[PDB]
């Protein structure tokens, strides 16, 4: 019964919470994990996305300098009061560099106007490309309105979809990503510290992502971390207390990395199985996936796990395309399926 144990989840102080593996997309565990909450700062993350998808793009470079205008003046817009700030001021020309730690390391409102205005052209045209985004991931719980964060009565988003933006962070845009392990940058002869204070923490390996509160929206933290290969994201909203700032979302990344590991038990191109084909230029179709695959499994138990499959259809009869799907791929551990993916043919198959 020790071998099949479902571990408890530990309690989280938190009105919302989610804990995923980055390779699989398995939820580990979970809690109000889609009710829709003000995301305060955690918003730039997705401005974060634009910005290095833009860059990747090669749109504009690192080494580029930015002019500051009049809205990405600090002090010259009020709405920016009690908030985090780089100081910038009109005719300052700033590289990107500078700014995208301001926005990522120190969560930075005006450098978020600053780099919406130079990637966009405006406010609104790149609150635009956020909600672009926040289709094209598919999030059915998350809406913006600022590129900071800022003033958005009508923003909204959850633990799961800000772990989601979490994992495309670091998928899609991994140059971008990977600043937000920097524990300090330096802007106008001073030293800010990034705001994630996780990244100080000796047991665990935390690289990223956002940390932010509101009297609105308690406190907000969306993390990840590695033990080899192996990734975490959390994302726990609606933190109640000041002292689980950080402690909270360890508890979870600690348990999560205790109780499961992730496993790659088959790479793309791989043949997984043969099958007779008719009408081909060939007499078998090399079978298996288009996407590596990633499980989330017990930790301990990746010897035990057996895999198998099923056909949809009688025959295969040629023409066959690549990535076709003809059939699914059955994981199983304990002669109970837990995870299914989708069997592909691995080269295409011409009528003879």
């Not at 920016?80 to 120190?106: A, C, D, H, Y």
């Not at 360890?250 to 099958?275: D, H, I, M, Q, Y």
Request: proline share 4%; glycine share 10%.
């Amino acid at each position: 019964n020790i071998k099949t144990m479902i571990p408890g989840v530990p309690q989280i102080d938190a009105e919302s919470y989610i804990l995923i593996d980055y390779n699989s997309g398995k939820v580990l565990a979970e809690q109000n994990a889609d009710v829709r909450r003000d995301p305060a700062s955690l918003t730039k993350m997705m401005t974060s996305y634009v910005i290095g998808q833009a860059m990747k793009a090669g749109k504009f470079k690192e080494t580029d300098l930015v002019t500051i205008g009049n809205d990405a003046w600090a002090t010259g817009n009020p709405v920016f009061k009690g908030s985090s700030l780089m100081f910038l001021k009109p005719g300052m020309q700033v590289p990107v560099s500078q700014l995208i730690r301001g926005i990522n390391l120190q969560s930075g409102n005006d450098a978020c106007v600053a780099m919406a205005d130079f990637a966009a052209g405006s406010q609104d045209a790149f609150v635009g490309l956020m909600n672009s985004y926040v289709n094209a991931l598919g999030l059915k719980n998350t809406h913006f309105q600022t590129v900071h964060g800022l003033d958005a009565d009508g923003q909204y988003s959850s633990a799961r979809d800000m772990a989601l933006i979490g994992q495309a962070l670091i998928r899609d845009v991994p140059n971008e990503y990977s600043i937000y392990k920097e524990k300090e940058f330096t802007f106008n002869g001073i030293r800010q510290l990034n705001r994630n204070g996780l990244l100080w923490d000796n047991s665990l390996n935390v690289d990223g992502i956002k940390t932010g509160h509101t009297d609105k929206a308690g406190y907000n933290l969306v993390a990840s971390a590695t033990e080899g290969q192996m990734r975490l994201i959390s994302a726990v909203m609606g933190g109640r207390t000041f002292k689980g700032r950080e402690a909270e979302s360890k508890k979870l990344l600690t348990w999560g990395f205790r109780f499961f590991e992730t496993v790659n038990p088959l790479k793309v191109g791989k043949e997984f199985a043969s099958e007779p084909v008719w009408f081909g230029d060939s007499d078998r179709a090399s079978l298996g996936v288009d996407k590596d695959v990633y499980l989330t499994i017990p930790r301990g138990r990746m010897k035990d796990l057996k895999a198998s499959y099923v056909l949809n259809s009688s025959e295969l009869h040629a023409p066959l395309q690549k990535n076709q799907v003809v059939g699914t791929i059955n994981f199983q551990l304990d002669g109970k399926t837990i995870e299914q993916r989708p069997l592909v043919v691995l080269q295409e198959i011409p009528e003879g």
